[PDB]
């Protein structure tokens, strides 16, 4: 089940965490170059909720 979570990003929870989204929790660490790779580990995301929105504050 942990391998499924890491492979898909889906948060299959019978109870639900205190989080909003249910998918896209794991990104694939791309190896185009070391700059891309190192920046993979320094990024923090607001959430998939705000991608599909109109308010821009």
């Amino acid at each position: 089940k942990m391998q499924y979570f890491l492979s898909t990003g889906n948060l299959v929870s019978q109870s639900g965490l205190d989080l909003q989204q249910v998918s896209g929790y794991t990104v694939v660490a791309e190896k185009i170059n070391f700059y891309r790779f190192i920046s993979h580990f320094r990024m923090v995301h607001r959430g998939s909720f705000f991608a599909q929105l109109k308010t821009t504050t």
């Binding site: 391998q3 890491l6 492979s7 205190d18 989080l19 929790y25 794991t26 990104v27 694939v28 660490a29 190896k31 190192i38 993979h40 580990f41 990024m43 923090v44 995301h45 607001r46 959430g47």
Partner: protein, 58 residues
């Protein structure tokens, strides 16, 4: 966990291999950090959906 760069290149990985990612089906994956509310702090909130929740809700 504690291998020096010499041992790291001996074990075929890299000179300065860094961690923080998983390997699943030979494809490297990372659990992306997410931003969430500050813990253990009561923060006053104004939100229209609080009133939209029901009636007489401010």
């Amino acid at each position: 966990n504690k291998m020096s760069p010499y041992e790291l290149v001996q074990h075929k990985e890299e000179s300065d291999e860094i961690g923080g990612y998983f390997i699943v089906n030979g494809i490297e994956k990372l659990i992306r950090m997410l931003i969430v509310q500050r813990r253990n702090h009561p923060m006053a909130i104004i939100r229209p959906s609080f009133a939209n929740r029901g009636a007489s809700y401010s």
